[PDB]
Structure formats: structure tokens, C-alpha cells
Amino acid sequence: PVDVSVSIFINKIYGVNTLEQTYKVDGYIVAQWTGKPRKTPGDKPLIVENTQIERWINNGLWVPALEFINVVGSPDTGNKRLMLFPDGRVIYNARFLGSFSNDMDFRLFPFDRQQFVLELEPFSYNNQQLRFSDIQVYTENIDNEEIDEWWIRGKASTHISDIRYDHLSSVQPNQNEFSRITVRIDAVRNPSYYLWSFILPLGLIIAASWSVFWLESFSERLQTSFTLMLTVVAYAFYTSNILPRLPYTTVIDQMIIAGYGSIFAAILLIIFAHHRQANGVEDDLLIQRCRLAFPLGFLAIGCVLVI
Amino acid sequence: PVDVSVSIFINKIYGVNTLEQTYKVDGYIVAQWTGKPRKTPGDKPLIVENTQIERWINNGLWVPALEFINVVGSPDTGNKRLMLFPDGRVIYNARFLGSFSNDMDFRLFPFDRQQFVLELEPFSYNNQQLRFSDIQVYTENIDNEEIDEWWIRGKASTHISDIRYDHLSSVQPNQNEFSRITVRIDAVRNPSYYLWSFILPLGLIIAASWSVFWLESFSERLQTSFTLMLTVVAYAFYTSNILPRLPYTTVIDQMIIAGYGSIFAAILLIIFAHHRQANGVEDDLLIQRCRLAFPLGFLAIGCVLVI
Amino acid sequence: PVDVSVSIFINKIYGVNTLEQTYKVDGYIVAQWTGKPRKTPGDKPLIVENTQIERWINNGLWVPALEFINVVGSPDTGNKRLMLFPDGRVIYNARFLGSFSNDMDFRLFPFDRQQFVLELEPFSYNNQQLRFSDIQVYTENIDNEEIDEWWIRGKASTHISDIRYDHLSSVQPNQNEFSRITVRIDAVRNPSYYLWSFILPLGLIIAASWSVFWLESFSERLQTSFTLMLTVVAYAFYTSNILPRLPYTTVIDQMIIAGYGSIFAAILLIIFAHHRQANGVEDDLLIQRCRLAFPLGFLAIGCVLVI
Amino acid sequence: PVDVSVSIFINKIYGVNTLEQTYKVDGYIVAQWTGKPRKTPGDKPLIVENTQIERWINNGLWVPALEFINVVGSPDTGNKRLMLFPDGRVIYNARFLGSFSNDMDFRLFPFDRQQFVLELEPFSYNNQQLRFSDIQVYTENIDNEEIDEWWIRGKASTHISDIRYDHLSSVQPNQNEFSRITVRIDAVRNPSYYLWSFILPLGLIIAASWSVFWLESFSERLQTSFTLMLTVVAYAFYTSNILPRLPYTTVIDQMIIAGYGSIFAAILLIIFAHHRQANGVEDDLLIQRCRLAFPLGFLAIGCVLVI
Amino acid sequence: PVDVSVSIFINKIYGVNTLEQTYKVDGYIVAQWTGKPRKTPGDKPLIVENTQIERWINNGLWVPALEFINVVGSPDTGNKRLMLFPDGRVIYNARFLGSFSNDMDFRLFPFDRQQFVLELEPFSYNNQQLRFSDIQVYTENIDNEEIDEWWIRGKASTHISDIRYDHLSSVQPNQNEFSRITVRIDAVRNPSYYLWSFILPLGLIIAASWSVFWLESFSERLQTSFTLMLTVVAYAFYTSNILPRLPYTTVIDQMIIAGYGSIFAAILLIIFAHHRQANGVEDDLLIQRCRLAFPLGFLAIGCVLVI
């Protein structure tokens, strides 16, 4: 089991496709291992660049293919470097961009807190043939300055795990198990755009839904309420292209459903108020005085639907 | 006919393009076959990695090209591995991403139940030259946890079929027939997003279409009904970008057509009620009392259009 | 002139980009020719797979490059096969996906009838050096089952034509002429989605445009008509993203222009009716009784604009 | 200075990205030059196809790389052909698709007249090492038949120019200058779609803006005018996705700004008419009679904003 | 430390993805260095073109890989040239397109002033093995002519810096430090499109929000205000697809929030005016006379929200 030391320098994280739960990570990967000693020209290390490492591999030099488990497709790799040292150690540096996938949990879409996971593993060599000793992830080029769409909180957690595989049991009897590296970078979404553009107008429209009751006759109350639905429909088609589709309901969508329930509540109370006239002569006072009780009640409802 | 054992490990299924009936499958494919025995360095199996299997193929090593029948383009393959054993068996492991196509049937778009089909077949070698013995599909990394947009129900069904070809009859007289593997993974769509965002507002708008009749004069009934159409038009341009185009009509679209038929029904009954005045003096009572019969009738109509 | 027999197996046709008049065709192409006889190992034909035909080509084996004339870019080819027979014939099988272009005529966009054209031609070898003998196109995997967005009507017509070129006259004096194969697959669009979602609401909105006249006073007639425009504007921004842009006007767009002309017609008749008051006292009866003549007249107009 | 004869056969021009000022050109390029005479097998010219010219180039055959100056990225080249003649001349044929860029001037977006520019130049060889003798551009497969989105007017103008470079002065003292070919194909946009879908409804809405004044009281005039803005806003979000963004204002956008200025003009005249009541008793006649002077005045304004 | 002279000719800058803070730069890069003298055929410099430099690199010729630090993926390189001189100097010319990233600061989105940064650095050779002497950036093909979406102000600033790396300390003890080149091209956005299409209608709608108060009764004031919200909602879904998402609020979005605050302000003053009736008989004069004080106050507010 040859010892391999991995260093992952995360250049930048961007392109968080919330639709597909993918995110593009750019960076560098550096693998250090020690093999047989060899003769180099001088004591200078021998640097082999891209479109030239492949000739050394065809010659018989051992370069492992450290794949990414959670990647989409194949990483659009850039330059690659191979330093052969006269001491006997080999350093493989590479630049990678990749669309990585993760099980993002969108419980609170404005206020989300996920982790970007890079999962690195040897493709063919098991634990008895290649073992990852340690990884230090240099998340240093990543920095939040309150303009970034994701605040990257803290450092990056590194984990060296050992993973067995069911599908390699048929081809390998007892050694079908691979070493693996998990790099988790905890990030929180910047909620200020959604707070200042997609939530405050819901508050204004729901306040308007409270203020619709101030009219003293029923027909233009109905016309006002149908104008409102339209308004709520227009702003519901607004914010229909920013967020993914999940079984449970994200915060913007409870606000939209709360707006729908409000406008309808207005419908049912004005129809009931029109039908409180038992003989067509009794006025509407106790149910028409909901201009201060219904607003506070739906403030409580909205406080529930935010918490 | 050399026996080939195939193991397909489905890593993840995503990107279901309902527009094009394509879906991206990531995974690994492992082909086991047995050829002539050979001399390897030691009893250790010889592992040949990517950009190095091609040299062995050019040397004269037999590696079949197991194509995907239902794939879009060519699969964006990643790392590939070839283990040559001193016993005499060869194991070809490969990582594939592919846009696969299937005849998806969108009878009930919120409540759909399809199957993702991976169709694997040798490209050039017929049944007399290469026969698939067995396939076990390790659908294990796939798991539903009620956040996924598709619930993957049960295991994956495997089928080894034998398929003849008409276009290879002109070039091969009697042996133009190929072995084939069909892997079907039954999946059901998560309907909760469509139920809680795209169907309940139809219920509210159609209930509003029922409540439009409570006004006691005809002109602002017409103005209210024209406001409503607009509302139904706005929400009909909503949900115009989520679903494909088919000959028959999916559940959201019967709800939209039902809304159109409702609003118009409101138009025709209020024009008829205005024209029930035979001499301009007869009032409208029996046709204006549809605030409790028309709603239940269209509840029955909606129950038909959901079932 | 070596005789080449071509067999094109159309796997599936999809992705009809009406914007760009391109469509993606997946399939296989099989070229049969006869050259010098050669010695093969045994009487078994020699099969040469992908990333190995190129070595035979570099050795000196003659493989023509049968290009597609009407393709966009280069076809994303998959696996390729070359059978060399001891008899003396060579069979080149290949799997191709291509974005093909054609002069689509969108006279009736819901009810369109076009033909998908695959135009195949040798890239460098003229008629005196390579002649296409016959083509049989196996359009068999293509089948309509009334869910497909295009019904493929009948078989595929094959045509072997002879095409001269002006730009190759300067480099080739008398033989600048190439053989060519045209494969035309006649298809008709499935109109049921457009009939049941994009035409019937025009009928409802135009019927509403007829029913706008039932109001007995002029000001709220104007307000209703301005609400209607908005409605027609909203549904005109609907269906603005499904169809291409042409000089002449497709069926949906005559319906939209007919709706605009209707609503305006309503404007001009109500302004004229308000101005039929010569001294401000004469009522409006003969021009206000267009609730049964204007609807039938625009039924005739719509029958013209559909036929 | 070796003489190179270029023939560019433009197959088709499409994909005019007005957003990015790029357009995709498909076609063929044929370079004729004369070098040292050579021995070929027979008097038949020797044809070298794609993935085989590179071996001749590595052998020592001189093939220049005729780059495109105004291309986006690298051209997605297809098949390439190299005819070596026993006489001594070499013909390099190639099929190219490219995203080409040009300084498109969108002064009149419905009625635009631009030119598609293909700029071809040797990458490394200056004028003293490679000189373009003549170019004839065979724009023949391009034809307008009044369905195309661009009418291609006339032939293609060819220009052989000589261009110096500042950045190659530091590496080449006196010969840093390259020959160049400019091919300009003048095209005019098909305006009929914009005339019949994006300009006539502006005329109808502005005519409605003229007809808003016919109401005899002020409050519902204001409500009608606020309905109108909404209408103008809805149709202003319509046609927000077809055209690029420029400093000056294209014809659709002067029509939208003219509509905004109209509706507001209606606002200011009805507020002024309500404020012409000096003591609340004086009626509004001279400023309310703008139902025939304001429409003709804004006909003149629109005639200015079209010309 | 071999001296390398770099010349970067920026052909064109376009495709500024404000969503991803990426921009596509096309251009040429020319590296001059001096190595061992060599024998060339004649005194003519030896030019080695693309798909032929790699053979010289495999032979043993030293060509450094000058990577881009801030690039997305790998640059879609085009033609490459290598001039070997008999004097002893080597010139490597290359054509590159790249998606480059930068920390764009969107404080004033119509009136933005950023800088496009190209960051060039040797991939493997440190300062002791390769040192950049000087760079002159020939920003000459870039020119503004008041049609471009970005005005490129002034020349391009060049900077030769020295950058240490933490992740290369584990593999290189004392020399882990690389020379680097930063090219900054200051650009300002063309604001005229946003001024003439996305800001002036906000002024008109807010002026309408001021003029809503002229009605003399409360119910249709409320209906007018609900029509207005809808208007503000429709134009708020307008301009929802042009700009990125940031923590702080860009100029269009303060205008949208200012419009929301206006319409609501109208709501609260008309509810308060209706509630200033202490016994239902006191009229509303002092709070209804805000048709000239509220407009100027919100002119001051808008002057704050623009400055």
C-alpha cells in the first residue's frame, strides 16, 4: 500500500445550479507519493508537462487516476504537471474544473445552509495498493466580502474514509474496497436579495389584503378582490424561475400560498357578510370590523409561516 | 460465443428532460469475459488505465465496444480500467454519463409513473461471437428520501433479449442478430410541488368563478368576469414552461381548460339572465340562484377531470 | 468508379428546432463496397473497431469519408466498425447523430407538413472515382403511436442524384461533379396541443369581444374594452416563445391580429355609437343591436382566417 | 511569396445572435497553391483525407493554417481534403462552421441592413512568405425566397487587403505585416414579422390612448388611464427578449416610449382639465375637445418617430 | 531564471456574464525567450505550426505552459506558432479565447465601472526557473464608438507581481513562489439603455402614484391603488432577468422598492384620511392636499435613492 498525500487548493466555487443540485468547483489537486528511486539529469527535479506525461505513462511510469465520485461527466482538466525527484518521490499537480453533485436540502431557500462536497477516490487501486495518508485542503483563495452569493463559513473539513463496493464483489473476491477522501465546505446563502426583493412585497400585498375590507359596499369589494388575485397571480409567476422543485414547500412558496389563502379569506368573509343579512335589512358591523383583528391574526399566521 | 458478464452500477439519475424525453444517467459498467490465458508479471492482476488501454487494443488485445442503443450522441465517458488476470479472464470497468431516451407517457403529469431504460448491446459482435450471460444491476447509490423529484420504486429489472436487425441483413446473410440487455428502473414523480403550487390556485380561482355570481347587477358582473379571464390568462401563461407538448391533455391543462369553460359559462349565464327579461321588467331569480348549484356541479366536473 | 451500397437506419428523429430549422437525427450508416481481395486470418471476416480503423487508414486502406451536406457542424459520431471480408468486399458501419438543416415552410404552424432531409455525399471522390449504386433506408425504429410530436407519414423516399459544383471548377477542369443521396422523410406535426391550448382560448376571448356590447352605457363599455386589450396583450405575450419568425403570418398570429382587430372594432363602434347622438338626445338602437350580427360576421372572418 | 488562390463557398448563414453580434456561417474553403513538383502514383492526383493530412504535415509537407480573424473560439471544422498533383500544385479543401463577429449597427431594428464579414488571414506566414492572389466567393447555395429571416442582397464583395500589426513589431523588426481577405455579404432583415406583430398593436394602443378622452367625468378617466399603463407595461414586457441593448434607441423602443408619453400626456391633460375649474363651477370644453387634435398631433409625432 | 517577454494582443472583449461574473476575452499571446543556440535550415527562422509543436516538445524542446489563473475551465485555444531562430531566441505565439472571472462590484448597475483582469502565470516553473521580464499589452483592436455595451476607458495597465503559494509549500520547501502578470483593463458600462428604458418608466409610474390622490372619494381610490400595485408588480417582473443577485441593492431595485413604498404610502394615507372622520362627518382637506407636497417629498426621496 503506497502512501499518497493529497492537497486540494480550491480556487473558486460558483455556478450553484439549484435546479440540478450541481455546483462548479475550480481548483488544483496535488498528489505526493514515493516510488522506486531513479536517475534524473542533475539534482534538479524533472518536470513533465501536459501532453508529455502520457508518453511517460506509456513508457511504464505509474501515475494513478484519482477520480471524483460526485462529479458530473468528466472534469474539464487543464494543465497537468509531474515532478520526478532524484530522491524517489513523485508529485502530480493538476488543474481541474468540475460540476459536482450533492444532496442539497432546501428547507429554507433564502436562509439555506449546505455543504459543498468534493469526493475523491482512486479509480482502480484498492486500499492494499494505494492508501491516502493525509489531506490538507487550502481553502484560501475563497473569501467572503459580503458581495458573494454564498458566504463560505469556516475552513474546509477533511475526512479520509474507507468504502466498500457491492458491484466489485463479483470481480474481486475479498479486496473490493477503496480508500476515499471527502472534503466538505460549509456554506450559507446570502439572504439579503430575497429579503429585500421577494419577501417585503409579499408583506405589502398581504397588508393590502388586510386593507381591502375598508370599503362600505359589497360589489366593488368583490371587484377589488378579483383585481388582487390577479396581482397575487402576477407576482406568483414572478419568482417562478429562481428556485428548484421539492416535495416540501420553501419559504417564498408558503408566502405565496399564504397570500392566496388571504385573498380567498377576503372572498369568504365578504360573501358571508353579504349573507349575514337574514331578511336583507340587517347591517354588517361585527364581521366588517375585521380591519384590526384579521391583520393581527394573519401577522401571527405569517410569524408561524416564517418560523 | 464468448460469455460476457455485465454489472451496471447506477450512481445517480437526474436531468429528466420532459421536453425531449431524455434523462442523464451516471454510473459504472463492468464487463467480465474469459479469453486465452496469458503471462502477467507475478500473480498480481495487470491493471491498465485510461489512455493506455488503446495501446493494448492496437497491440491486438480484444476489447469489445458495448454501445448504448437509446443514448443521445456518445456517452461522455470518464476513467476506464482493464484488469488482465493470469487465470485468463479480463475485466473492463468504465465510468459513463449518458443522455438516454425513452418513450415517456405523460398521461398524468403530476402523478406520472415511467421507467428509465438503459439498453446495452455489442456494436459489432453478434450472438455467435459474443453472448451476454447475466446482468446484475446494483441500483444501490440510488435512494429516495422524500426530497428527490423522482421516487425510485423497487429494484431495477434486468432483461437479456435477442434482437434481429433488418438493415444488417444486406451485409450479413444469416447472422445479423445481436444480443441485448434492457435495464428498466421504475420511477414515480413527486407530485407534492404540483399539488401545492399548480393545482390548489386553480381550485381557488374556480371557486372565485363560482362566487362571481353574487353581484346584483349585470354590468359590473361583466367587468368582474373580464377581470377574471385576465386572471385565468395570467395563470395560464404561468405553468407554460414546465411540461412538454403532447396530443392528449395533461392534468394541469384540463384544469386550465376547465377554468376557461367556467369563466365563459359565467359569461353565458349572465347574458342569458339579462335576456330572460322578456319585456325588460321580469326579474332574475331562478337563474341567479346558481350560487350553490353551479359550484357543486363544477365540483362534480372537476372530480371527473381529476379522475 | 467503385460501386458503393448505402443503408441508412434512422434510429430516432427529435429536437426539431423550429427557430433555426434544424433537427437532430440519430442513426446508423452502412457503406458496402468491393475492392481488391485480401488475406484474412481464417474465413472469418476481420472486424476493426473504433480508434483502430485509423491505423488501417494510415497503413493504406481505402475508407471514404461520406459527409453530410445539410449537417450543422460535424456529426457527433459514436462507434465505427470496418468488416474486411476474404471475398474482397468492405463494410463500413457507423453510428451518427447530427443536427441537420432543411428549408422548413411554416405556412400552417399547428398543421404543418414538412420533410426531414438527410443529404449524403462523398467529400472528395467524384462520380468517376466513387458511385452510389443504391440506398435502402430502414425507417423502422421510427413509429408514431399518437403521443409523438411529429407523425411520420409513410416510408422514407430515397433519391440518387448527380450534382455539379461551381467552386470546384477552378481546381478540377472537367470532373468537378459528385454523386449524392437525398433521403426525404415526410412528417406532419401533431396539432392537438395547439388546438386544445392555443386556439380555443382565442375563440373564447373573441366571443367575449362579441359579448362586450351588452352593456347599456358607454363609459364602462370603454373600461371593459381596455381591460380586454390587456387580456389580449397578456395572451399575446403568451405563445410568443413557441414558434419561429417568418415574413408571412402563421395561424396563431392571424388569430392574435384578429383579436386585436376585434377589440378595436369594439372601440370604434362604441365611439361611433356615442357620436351618433346628433344633438345629444338621440338613442343608440340600430348600432347597439350588433350582439348577433357582429358575432356571426366575425365567425365568417375567423372561418376565412382559418381556411 | 507563394501565390495562394482562395475560393469560399458559403453554404448557409444563420443563427444571427443580435445579443452578441455573432452569426454562424457554414461553408467550404479551398486553397490552391503551387510548390515543388513531386512524384505521385500514376497521373491520378493523390487525395489525402482527414486524420491523414496530419501525417503528411509531420512528414514535412507544407500546409498553411488559414485562420479566421473575426471568429469566436475555433471553427468546428469537419472533413478536410488535400489533393497533391503531379504537376506541382496543392489544393486544400475544408469544411468549416464558425461563429463570426461583426460590428452590427442596429439603427432601425425592424429595417436593419448589415453585412456579414468573413475575415481570413494566414496565421504565421507574412506577405513575403504567402500572398493571396485572388478570391472568388461562390455565394450560390444562399438564396432568398421571402421566407428567410434575412434577405441576402446581391453578390458577395471580395477584398484583398494588407494589414500591419503592432504586437508583432517586437518579435519581427521590419516584416510584421500580413495579407488578408475580407468577404462582405450585404443582408437586409425581413421586417414583415415586426410590422405585423410588434408595431401595429402599438398603433392600436396609442389610438386607444387617443380615445380615452371620450369619457365625460374625471375619476373613471383616471381609472381607465391606470388600466392603460398596465396595458402598456404588459406589452412593454412583451418584446423585451428579441433585441439587443444599445446606447441609442431602436424603433420598437421609441414606440414604447411614445406610448408611455401618450398615456402620461393623458394624465396631465385630465388633471389640468380638473384644475381648469377656477371656482369649481367652470366646465371643461376647449381642453376636452382634444379627441380630434391630439390624435392628429400624435400621428405627426409618430411619423417623426418612424422616419 | 530565463527571461520571458510577453505581449498580449486583446482582440475583443464580450460576453460579460453578470450572473457568473465571467467575461469572454479573445486575443493572442506572444512569449519571447532565449535558450541555447541551434542550427536551422538557412538563416530563415523555423516556423512550427499547430499539431506539430507537440512533436518538438516530445523531442525535447522546452516550451513553457503559461496558464491563466482566473480562467473558467481551459481556454479554447486556436492556432499556435513556434518560431525558432538561428540567433537562439524562441517566440511562441498563440490564439486564445477564455472565460475569465473577476470580483465585479455592482454598486451602481446602470453606471458600473469595473476592470477586466487577465492573470497569467507559469504553471510549473517558479521564479528561479522562469521570470517574466516585461509585458506590453496591445489593446488596439478594442475601440469604443458609442454603440458598444462597455466603453473601454484608457489603456490597459500591466503589472508584474510575485506570488507565493501555501499549497506548494508541502512539495517545495523554500521555492514555492511564482512570477505572475496582471493585466487590468478599466471599463465602464453604457448606461443609456437602462436610463431610457428601465428608469424613466419608474419616474412615470411614481408620478402616477403621486397623481392617484386627485380622486374625491375613497373606494375607487382604493381600487385605483390596487390597479397600481398590479402595474408595479408587472413592471417588477419586468427587469427581473437582466441583473445578478447581490447582498446590497442595485439602482433599479431601489427604484422598485421605492415604487412599492410609494403605492403603500398611498394606501396608508387614504386609510388614515378615511379614519380622520372622528364622527363620520368631518371632511378631509389637510391630508387630501398632498397632491403637491408628497410629490416633491418623494422627488427628494428619489434624489436620495439615485445619489
CA distance D226 to chain E (A): 7
Our CA-based measurement puts residue A181 at a distance from the nearest CA of chain B, in whole angstroms, of 17
Q: In terms of C-beta density within 10 A (0-12 exposed, 13-18 middle, 19 or more buried), how is residue A162 classed? A: exposed
Which chains pack against A, by 3+ Cβ pairs within 8 A? B, E
* E18 contact partners, CB below 8 Å, separation of at least 6: E104, E106, E243, E244
Place of cell 474496497: A177
> B141 in helix, strand or coil?
coil
**C-alpha cell of E239?**
427587469
Return the half-sphere exposure (C-beta side, CA atoms, 13 A cut-off) of residue E55. Answer: 11
d(CA A177, CA A164) in angstroms, rounded, equals 4
CB-CB under 8 Å, D136 with C170: yes
Q: Quick check: A227 and E230 CB within 8 A?
A: yes
Instruction: Identify all chain A residues contacting E227, using CB atoms and an 8 Å cutoff.
Output: 227
Rounded Cα gap, residues C241 and E306, in angstroms: 35
Q: Side chain identity at A135, as an amino acid letter?
A: I
Determine contact, residues E1/E129, Cβ cutoff 8 Å. Answer: yes
Q: What is the DSSP letter of E85?
A: P
Identify all chain C residues contacting B222, using CB atoms and an 8 Å cutoff.
211-212, 214-215, 224
Task: Give the residue among A265, A269, A295, A303 at the shortest CA–CA distance from A284.
Answer: A269
Q: Would an 8 Å CB–CB cutoff place E49 in contact with chain A? A: no
Q: Does B203 touch chain A (CB under 8 A)?
A: no
Instruction: Tell whether E215 is within 8 A of chain D (Cβ).
Output: yes
Instruction: Tell if the CB–CB gap between E218 and A223 is shorter than 8 Å.
Output: no
Residue in A closest to E21 by C-alpha: A14
Identify how many contiguous H helices and E strands chain A contains and give both numbers: 6, 11
Grid cell of E76 as nine digits? 479554447
Preferred mutation among B4, B74, B79, B134 to probe A, highest tally of A CBs within 10 A: B79
| Torsion-angle region of E306 (φ positive above 0: left; ψ -120 to 50: alpha; else: beta) | alpha
Give residue C7's identity as a one-letter amino acid code.
S
Cβ–Cβ contact B149 with A under 8 A: yes
Q: How many CB atoms sit inside 10 A of residue D293's CB?
A: 10
Take residue C16 and report the three cell numbers written for it: 426539431
Compute the residue count for chain C.
Answer: 307
Q: Helix D218-237 to helix C218-237 angle, to the nearest 10 degrees?
A: 10
Say yes or no: E136 contacts chain D, CB-CB below 8 A. yes
Q: Which of residues 73-92 of D touch E (CB under 8 A)?
A: 73-74
- B303's CB contacts (< 8 A; 6+ apart) are none
CA B289 – CA B297 distance, rounded (Å): 13
The x, y and z cell numbers of residue D267, run together, are 394624465
Question: C80: which strand partners?
Answer: C94
Interchain contact B143–C (C-beta under 8 A): no
Strands D2-17 and D130-137: what pairing?
parallel
Report yes or no: E236 at the A interface, CB cutoff 8 Å. Answer: yes
Chain D interface includes E58 (CB < 8 A): no
Q: Compute the CA torsion angle D149, D153, D156, D162 (nearest 10 deg).
A: -90
**Measured distance CA(B125)–CA(A280) in Å, rounded:** 88
Q: What is the resolution of this structure in A?
A: 3.7
Q: How far is CA E276 from the centre of its chain?
A: 52
Backbone torsions φ then ψ of A220, nearest 5 degrees? -80, -15
Whether the CB of D123 is below 8 Å from some CB of chain E: the reply is yes
Q: Which of D101, D247, D260 sits opposite E192 (nearest CB)?
A: D247
Residues 246-265 of D with CB under 8 A from C: none
3-class DSSP state for residue A89? strand
**Number of C-alpha atoms within 13 angstroms, CB side, residue E61?**
21
B contacts of A123 (beta carbons < 8 Å):
49, 79, 81, 95
Chains contacting E (3+ CB pairs below 8 angstroms)? A, D
Partner-chain contact B95 A246, CB within 8 Å = no
Chain C environment of D216 (Cβ under 8 Å): 219
Q: In this structure, which amino acid lies at residue B301?
A: I
Cα separation, E104 vs E112, whole angstroms: 9
Alpha-carbon distance of D44 to C120, in angstroms, equals 25
Burial zone of B221 (CB within 10 Å; 0-12 exposed, 13-18 middle, 19+ buried): buried
Q: At what angle do helices D251-275 and D218-237 cross, to 10 degrees?
A: 170
Residue of C nearest to D214 (CA): C271
CA distances to A73, E37, E64, E85, E159 from E33, rounded to whole Å, are 39, 12, 10, 11, 19
Q: What are phi and psi of D284, to 5 degrees?
A: -120, 105
List the grid coordinates of B63: 476489447
Q: Which residues contact residue A41 at a Cβ distance below 8 angstroms, ignoring those fewer than 6 apart?
A: none
Q: Which single residue is written with the C-alpha cell 402614484?
A: E209
The distance of D6 to chain C (nearest Cα, Å) reads 10
| Residue D116 near residue D110, CB atoms below 8 Å | no
Task: Delineate the domains of chain B, giving CATH numbers in brackets.
Answer: 1-190 (2.70.170.10), 191-307 (1.20.58.390)
Cell numbers representing residue A109 in the block: 431557500
HSE value, Cβ hemisphere, 13 Å, CA-based, for D98: 26
Long-range residue pairs from E146-150, CB within 8 A, at least 24 positions apart, any chain: E146/D247, E146/E190, E147/D103, E147/D105, E147/D246, E147/D247, E147/D248, E148/E190, E149/D245, E149/D246, E149/E16, E149/E189, E149/E190, E150/E13, E150/E16, E150/E187, E150/E188, E150/E189, E150/E190
Could you tell me how many helices (H) and strands (E) chain E has, helices first? 6, 11
Cα–Cα distance for residue pair D148/C140, rounded to 1 Å: 33
Mapped onto helix, strand or coil, the DSSP state of residue E111 is coil
Chain D residue closest in CA terms to E7: D167
According to DSSP, residue B85 is labeled: P
As a three-state string, the secondary structure of chain C is: CEEEEEEEEEEEEEEEECCCCEEEEEEEEEEEEECCCCCCCCCCCEEECCCCHHHHHHHCCCCCCEEECCEECCCCCCCEEEEECCCCEEEEEEEEEEEEECCCCCCCCCCCEEEEEEEEEECCCCCCCEEEEEEEECCCCCCCCCCCCEEEEEEEEEEEEEECCCCCCCCCCCCCCEEEEEEEEEEEECCHHHHHHHHHHHHHHHHHHHHHHHCCCHHHHHHHHHHHHHHHHHHHHCCCCCCCCCCCCCHHHHHHHHHHHHHHHHHHHHHHHHHCCCCCCCCCCCCCCCCCCHHHHHHHHHHHHHC
Residues in Cβ contact with A141 at an 8 Å cutoff, skipping those fewer than 6 apart: A9, A10, A11, A12
Among B78, B73, B122, B79, which residue's Cα sits nearest to residue B99?
B73
Q: Which position has the grid cell 427578449?
A: D241
Distance from C-alpha of A100 to C-alpha of A120, rounded to nearest angstrom: 11
Length of chain B: 307
Q: Say if CB E147 and CB E206 are below 8 A apart.
A: no
Measure CA A250 to chain center: 14
Of B14, B78, B216, the CB nearest to A74: B78
Q: Which three cell numbers stand for residue E214?
A: 386627485
Of B220, B233, B247, the CB nearest to C147: B247
- Identify the H or E element spanning D156: strand D150-163
Q: Is A197 on the interface with E (CB under 8 A)?
A: yes
Cell readout for B35 is 479469453
**Is D295's Cβ below 8 Å from some Cβ in C?**
no
Please name the chains neighbouring B, where neighbouring means 3+ C-beta pairs under 8 angstroms.
A, C
